Amino acid sequence: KVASLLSADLTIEGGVTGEGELQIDGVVKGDVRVGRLTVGETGHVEGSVYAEAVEVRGRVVGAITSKQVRLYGTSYVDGDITHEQLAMETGAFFQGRSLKFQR
């Protein structure tokens, strides 16, 4: 109960909550609340996601809010980013308005 798996034939609506690691290889339309978030291979995420840590392995365009973020895989990010700690790994391609935490 700490590694859920949402197929691709699944789509999020409005907003959903959860706990632990969330493996999703589908499309997200709305809000998302969870501890860890792994973006499957479908790489489809459109909305506002709020979490503590996330590992991208696909594409997520919209808005992200998390103190920890790591762009893994040929992932992509387009939108407003807000993170205190960030790490770029080979395959990270994001053109959006990024906001770095100064002080």
What does this protein look like?
- With 103 residues, the protein is mostly beta strands.
- The chain has one domain.
- The chain contains no helices and eleven strands.
- Strands 1, 2, 3, 4, 5, 6, 7, 8, 9, 10 and 11 form an eleven-stranded parallel beta sheet that branches.
- It is classed as structural protein.
- Keywords: BacA, beta helix.
Could you give a short account of the major beta sheet?
11 strands, parallel
* Global structural class: mainly beta
Total count of helical runs of at least 4 residues: 0
Q: Which of globular, elongated, flat, extended, rod-shaped describes the shape?
A: globular
Cα(first) to Cα(last) distance is 37 Å
Give the arrangement of secondary structure elements.
Elements: E1 3-6, E2 11-17, E3 21-24, E4 27-39, E5 46-56, E6 59-65, E7 68-71, E8 76-83, E9 85-88, E10 93-94, E11 98-100
Parallel strand pairs: 1-3, 2-4, 3-4, 4-5, 5-6, 5-7, 6-8, 7-9, 8-10, 8-11
Protein name: Bactofilin A
Family: Belongs to the bactofilin family.
Organism: Caulobacter vibrioides (strain ATCC 19089 / CIP 103742 / CB 15) (Caulobacter crescentus)
Offer a few descriptive terms.
103 residues; mainly beta; eleven-stranded parallel beta sheet; 0% helix; Bactofilin A
